Amino acid sequence: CPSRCSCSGTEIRCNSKGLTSVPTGIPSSATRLELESNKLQSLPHGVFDKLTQLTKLSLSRNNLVTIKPEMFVNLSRLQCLSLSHNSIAQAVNGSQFLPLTNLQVLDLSHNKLDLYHWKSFSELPQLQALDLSYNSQPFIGHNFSFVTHLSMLQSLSLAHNDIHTRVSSHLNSNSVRFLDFSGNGMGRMWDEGGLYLHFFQGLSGLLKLDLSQNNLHILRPQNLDNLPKSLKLLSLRDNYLSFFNWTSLSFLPNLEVLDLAGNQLKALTNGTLPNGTLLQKLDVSSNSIVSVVPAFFALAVELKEVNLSHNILKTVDRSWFGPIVMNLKELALDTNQLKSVPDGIFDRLTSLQKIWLHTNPWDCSCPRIDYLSRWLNKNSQKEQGSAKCSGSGKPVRSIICP
Numbered sequence: 001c002p003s004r005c006s007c008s009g010t011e012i013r014c015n016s017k018g019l020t021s022v023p024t025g026i027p028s029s030a031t032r033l034e035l036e037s038n039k040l041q042s043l044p045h046g047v048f049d050k051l052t053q054l055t056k057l058s059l060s061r062n063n064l065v066t067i068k069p070e071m072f073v074n075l076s077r078l079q080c081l082s083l084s085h086n087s088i089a090q091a092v093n094g095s096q097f098l099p100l101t102n103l104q105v106l107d108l109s110h111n112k113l114d115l116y117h118w119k120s121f122s123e124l125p126q127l128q129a130l131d132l133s134y135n136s137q138p139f140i141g142h143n144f145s146f147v148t149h150l151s152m153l154q155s156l157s158l159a160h161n162d163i164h165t166r167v168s169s170h171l172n173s174n175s176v177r178f179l180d181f182s183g184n185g186m187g188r189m190w191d192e193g194g195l196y197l198h199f200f201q202g203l204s205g206l207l208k209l210d211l212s213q214n215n216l217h218i219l220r221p222q223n224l225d226n227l228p229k230s231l232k233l234l235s236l237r238d239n240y241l242s243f244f245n246w247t248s249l250s251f252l253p254n255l256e257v258l259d260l261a262g263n264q265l266k267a268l269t270n271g272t273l274p275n276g277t278l279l280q281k282l283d284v285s286s287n288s289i290v291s292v293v294p295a296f297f298a299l300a301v302e303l304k305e306v307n308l309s310h311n312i313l314k315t316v317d318r319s320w321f322g323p324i325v326m327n328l329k330e331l332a333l334d335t336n337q338l339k340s341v342p343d344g345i346f347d348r349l350t351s352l353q354k355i356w357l358h359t360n361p362w363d364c365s366c367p368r369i370d371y372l373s374r375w376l377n378k379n380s381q382k383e384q385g386s387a388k389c390s391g392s393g394k395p396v397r398s399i400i401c402p
């Protein structure tokens with residue numbers, strides 16, 4: 001075992017030691033190596049000569065100057081590599097990773113790489129997961145067709161790459177299942193006529209799409225209609241949507257999870273969840289939701305969890321606390337301005353496992369919270385956190401009305 005290193009099994013860690021070069025005398029039997037948070041600039045010839053057992057390597061958070069194919073000679077057995085946080089400024093065009101013929105996962109996030117060239121990563125036939133996050137400011141290529149030749153690729157991240165103009169109009173693949181497009185400019189792109197109207201459509205069996213933090217202020221229905229029809233998860237978290245056309249969910253026939261948190265919805269209104277939706281989880285926390293229209297949730301028969309947390313909900317109505325919402329597994333209503341709840345409303349919650357009610361100004365005067373006192377007292381195991389009375393800090397579960 002080398003100086004300045006923690007050796008544990010065949011897993012070896014030399015993190016945050018200010019190293020300017022690789023420690024000599026790493027056991028040749030090593031299968032995992034970490035050289036994170038140092039000051040490495042070079043991988044001199046022969047440096048990994050004896051580490052033929054290595055399948056996982058992280059050079060995360062250093063100062064590598066360039067990627068050369070010959071840096072990876074002897075590292076051909078590698079299945080995972082990280083070169084994240086090295087701010088390498090250079091083009092990637094199919095000649096960088098030549099000898100990494102077994103590599104399945106590659107992390108290139110937090111660099112300055114000019115990545116979008118049609119031949120990029122074609123020297124990596126077996127690549128399954130590729131993280132290109134945080135390469136806004138490439139040191140340029142405009143071309144995304146490289147992803148369509150990686151026939152094993154399941155997971156891709158283009159997140160936070162300032163992607164907004166002059167790029168391929170279509171992404172194409174038969175293998176990617178998860179695309180992270182977080183932090184880009186889809187908002188500007190979808191405003192540009194029909195130029196990007198079919199951008200994600202060619203991602204054939206896509207299952208999850210993250211469009212959070214895309215500066216979306218509106219969502220035209222055609223844009224949803226042109227998402228891949230296999231989509232199960234859509235994330236629109238932390239945009240600026242003030243409105244949402246709920247009947248558009250019919251364009252997404254297999255959707256199970258919709259994340260709308262951190263937007264600016266003023267209510268659950270402008271329609272209801274549409275007939276036939278297979279929606280299971282609806283995260284609509286951290287909006288400015290003041291009210292819910294009657295029967296909004298009704299008729300979404302597969303609905304399993306709704307997060308209404310961190311809003312400004314004034315009341316809970318029978319008109320919208322209707323049979324679907326009674327059949328939830330999880331219901332979050334915490335952090336919300338609720339003073340009371342109608343009697344008997346939580347009585348037929350037969351599938352409920354967790355409910356959140358805290359951080360609400362509950363009125364604990366007696367012939368009013370009696371039902372809720374009682375219910376929270378009976379269902380203690382189901383409450384997450386504790387609803388407290390607005391006057392005294394007493395938990396609602398503790399009030400016994402006469």
Ligand SMILES: *[C@@H]1O[C@H](CO)[C@@H](O)[C@H](O)[C@H]1NC(C)=O
Pocket residue numbers: 090091092093095096
């Ligand atoms: C490919 O990129 C390398 C740097 O990574 C560069 O030196 C070379 O000119 C590029 N090749 C092409 C086709 O432009």
Ligand SMILES: *[C@@H]1O[C@H](CO)[C@@H](O)[C@H](O)[C@H]1NC(C)=O
Pocket residue numbers: 118142143144145167168169
């Ligand atoms: C990407 O490169 C391919 C290969 O030449 C070409 O068919 C395509 O037009 C290019 N796309 C863009 C946006 O330049």
Ligand SMILES: *[C@@H]1O[C@H](CO)[C@@H](O)[C@H](O)[C@H]1NC(C)=O
Pocket residue numbers: 221245247248270
């Ligand atoms: C919602 O979208 C549908 C198409 O999905 C459209 O026909 C309808 O007019 C829209 N409703 C509103 C109020 O924008």
Ligand SMILES: *[C@@H]1O[C@H](CO)[C@@H](O)[C@H](O)[C@H]1NC(C)=O
Pocket residue numbers: 243269270
């Ligand atoms: C949605 O509902 C409110 C009234 O509840 C209305 O002011 C708003 O204009 C509606 N949105 C659209 C686009 O129809």
Ligand SMILES: *[C@@H]1O[C@H](CO)[C@@H](O)[C@H](O)[C@H]1NC(C)=O
Pocket residue numbers: 261285286307309310330332
């Ligand atoms: C609901 O939303 C809040 C954040 O807005 C979060 O604390 C919590 O994780 C969510 N609840 C569940 C059960 O995921």
